[PDB]
Write a protein that binds this ligand. Sequence first.
Ligand code: HEM
Ligand code: HEM
Lengths: 145, 145
Amino acid sequence: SVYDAAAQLTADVKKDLRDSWKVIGSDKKGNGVAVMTTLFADNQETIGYFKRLGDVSQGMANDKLRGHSITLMYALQNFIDQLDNPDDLVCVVEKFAVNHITRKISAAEFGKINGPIKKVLASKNFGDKYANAWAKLVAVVQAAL
Amino acid sequence: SVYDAAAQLTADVKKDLRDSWKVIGSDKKGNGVAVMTTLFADNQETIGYFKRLGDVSQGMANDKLRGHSITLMYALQNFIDQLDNPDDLVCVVEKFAVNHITRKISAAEFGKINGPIKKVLASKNFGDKYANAWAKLVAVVQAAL
Ligand code: HEM
Ligand code: HEM
C-alpha cells in the first residue's frame, strides 16, 4: 500500500529529507548526472532500459542524458514539496509510477537507485542516516509499482 | 532552431517571466489545476488526449488530474530555472518535446496552452506584457515540435 508507505514518513524522516535536499538539490544538473552515471556503473544491467538516451558513457556531454537527469531531480523536488500533504504526495508518486510501469520497471529494479543516492549523499558528507531516510521515500514509489 | 528561439529570450523577457512565476509558481496545485481546467473549458477538443486522467470535469477531486497538474507546474519550474543557460534550457525543452511528440501533439496544438496561461496570469493581475513573455517561452517548445 502506497498509503501505508507514505505514513512511514515521520517527523524525523521528513526533517532529514529536507535538510539533505537543501544540499543535493542545490546542483540539480551535477548531482542528477552523478546519480544516473553511478546507476549505470554499479548496475550495468539497467543500461538497456535507457536506449533513447544514446551513449550514456559520455555523461554530462550527452544532451539527452543531461536533460533527463535535470528533470529527474525536479521529480525529487516535487516529492519533497509534497511532504506536508500525504494525499498530494501520493498522487504525484502514482504519476511517476505509471511512467515506469510503462517501461516495465519493477519495484525491485526501481530500488537499485538506493545505491547511487547513498553514494551521492556520502560524497557530500551525508551518511547512512540520510541514506535510510531517502530509502523510505523511494519505498513510497516502490509501493505503487 | 530551438537554440535560436531560446538564445533570443532577452533580459527584460526573463525578468517578466521570473517576476510572474514567483507568484503563479507559489501555488502549483491551485494554479496548475486552474490551467488544465481552463484548457478543457475553452478547448473541449483536447479532452480526448487526456483519457488516462479519467473524468477531468472532477477537477481537484480527481487525483490523477491533480498529480498531472502539479507535475506540469514543475516542468515550468524547470524551464524558469534554466533561463540563464540556453544550453541547459534546450536539453530540458527537447526532453519534454519528446513527451508530446509521442502523443502526436503538433506545434500548433501545443500553442493552445497560451490562452489558459494568459487567463491564469490575469487572475493574479499580470497583464498582456506578461502573457506575451510566456508565449515567447512556449514558443521555445514549439520550435522543437
Ligand atoms: C529516485 C528514483 C527515480 C525517479 C524519481 C525517476 C524519475 C524519472 C522521470 C521524471 C522520468 C521521465 C518520465 C517520462 O518523461 O516518461 C523517468 C524516466 C525513466 N526512468 Fe526513472 N526514475 C527513478 C529511478 C529509475 C530507475 C532505478 C530505473 C531503472 C532501473 C528507471 C528507469 C526509467 C526509464 C527507462 C525511463 C525512460 C527514459 C526515457 O526513455 O526517456 N528510473 N524517470
Ligand atoms: C505549458 C505547456 C505544457 C507543459 C509544460 C506540459 C507538460 C506536460 C508534462 C510534464 C507531461 C507528463 C509527461 C509524461 O510523464 O509522459 C505532459 C503530458 C501530456 N501533455 Fe502536456 N504540457 C503542456 C501543454 C500541453 C498541451 C497544450 C497539450 C494538448 C494539446 C498537451 C498534451 C499532453 C498529453 C496528451 C499528455 C499525456 C497525459 C497522460 O496521458 O498522462 N500538453 N505534459
